[PDB]
Subunit: 114 residues, 4 copies
Amino acid sequence: ATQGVFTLPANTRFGVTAFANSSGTQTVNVLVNNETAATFSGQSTNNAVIGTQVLNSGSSGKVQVQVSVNGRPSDLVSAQVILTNELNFALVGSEDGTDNDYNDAVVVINWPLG
Amino acid sequence: ATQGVFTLPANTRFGVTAFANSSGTQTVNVLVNNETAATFSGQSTNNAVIGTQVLNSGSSGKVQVQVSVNGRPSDLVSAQVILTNELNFALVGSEDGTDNDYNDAVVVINWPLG
Amino acid sequence: ATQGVFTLPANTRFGVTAFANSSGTQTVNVLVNNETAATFSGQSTNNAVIGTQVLNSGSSGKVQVQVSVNGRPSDLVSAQVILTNELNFALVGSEDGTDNDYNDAVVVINWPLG
Amino acid sequence: ATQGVFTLPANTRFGVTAFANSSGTQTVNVLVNNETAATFSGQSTNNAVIGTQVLNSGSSGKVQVQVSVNGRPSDLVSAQVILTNELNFALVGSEDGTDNDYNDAVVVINWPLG
Ligand SMILES: C/C(O)=C1/C=C(CO[C@@H]2O[C@@H](C)[C@@H](O)[C@@H](O)[C@@H]2O)ON1
Ligand SMILES: C/C(O)=C1/C=C(CO[C@@H]2O[C@@H](C)[C@@H](O)[C@@H](O)[C@@H]2O)ON1
Ligand SMILES: C/C(O)=C1/C=C(CO[C@@H]2O[C@@H](C)[C@@H](O)[C@@H](O)[C@@H]2O)ON1
Ligand SMILES: C[C@@H]1O[C@@H](O)[C@@H](O)[C@H](O)[C@@H]1O
Ligand SMILES: [Ca+2]
Ligand SMILES: [Ca+2]
Ligand SMILES: [Ca+2]
Ligand SMILES: [Ca+2]
Ligand SMILES: [Ca+2]
Ligand SMILES: [Ca+2]
Ligand SMILES: [Ca+2]
Ligand SMILES: [Ca+2]
């Protein structure tokens, strides 16, 4: 199944934050309407924040997260959770190797803001 | 129901990260086995990452998040999600006012790390 | 925070199914647009399905679950989960007593159907 | 990533319930410790409960859901969500064709019971 693709309400600000947990340098690309809108890159085995940003979901509301390590695409896992019918989290884990901890880059998208 | 309380794997490092979205200054306390282990604070209506820290869940694994504004406790919402039977997120929203957006402080706990 | 309230896409069919795990008879009311659209009732300590039905979310998409036992509303917990950006679960637990297992009536709403 | 595999607490009763939404007859097999413990089959495009049963997670706690149509495995998606640190849902969707609604068989596992 496709992973890392989310439909947000149109024209809505959202936060995107990435953490790293791997020996490999993580490159996280955030697409809005199929065009790159943010890119973060960093290396940590201690959950360091490698980027955070606020983006707008635009007319389509389509947001996609991609993760790669030295050009090799990571396998993704994802889901969306909504609390009290208001607060949204779109969550992504990724695997760059063999251990299947799926934390090598972790990406959190949250909305609404403000 | 009780919210903002999570049983983590014992003795395990986790990330805890807080975001602010309110005119009120947020204070987030993170308790491990009923003792304050981290405190974050700030004021943003644009999702500022007011704190991020790596903690150990300790012998019992009990982690609790509390949020206050002006010394008054915010109302909390929470859940835990697990992806591919291994990647964990404990999620908290909080409300300091009347609009019920529940984003006034948002807290994300993630494990495993490394 | 309010629990058991979900905004579905408008005019969309959804499944609603209730399970019982309590000494007490559970009555589950499913509201669409703030009117009771279905009622289930039964008693089980073995997770019996006490009702299942397909409903339409109607023009507003507002769906609410309420649970009563022994003449008093049960305390509710809830969340919505979306898998692969397609498959939606709106989940409700409820507590009629003191043990806080929150399974006394469990309600699962799923969409889309077909 | 692997989907449809969950680790439950050992020796614990759980509910498993399957719904169908496809022109194809769904076969749902629920494995405990790698051996089939329940099986449900049926065709519906109206979310019929093609089966619901109480199982015990046994010594290993390992539960896996498999879905197929006339022997051909469906593609699975899954996640687990925990409410108020106690109430557990393990969720599975599946796709037997090309439209990616992932509702062709929907399986919900819930615990604790009683
Ligand atoms: C092909 C490629 O890039 C790798 C990198 C690793 C080491 O493994 C990576 O770093 C370790 C310190 C762990 O965080 C592990 O989860 C991660 O996958 O294995 N394969
Ligand atoms: C106690 C205290 O400081 C407040 C501030 C507000 C205004 O409301 C707060 O700020 C607004 C800009 C919104 O983000 C709103 O969701 C938030 O609840 O109400 N109470
Ligand atoms: C292998 C087999 O039997 C099928 C049936 C379909 C048609 O598609 C199936 O039925 C339709 C009515 C929709 O519910 C669709 O989501 C489902 O995938 O595709 N493959
Ligand atoms: C048999 C018992 O019945 C009621 O007391 C429930 O609140 C308990 O959770 C338990 O199911
Ligand atoms: Ca890894
Ligand atoms: Ca890792
Ligand atoms: Ca607010
Ligand atoms: Ca706010
Ligand atoms: Ca109870
Ligand atoms: Ca009970
Ligand atoms: Ca399908
Ligand atoms: Ca279908």
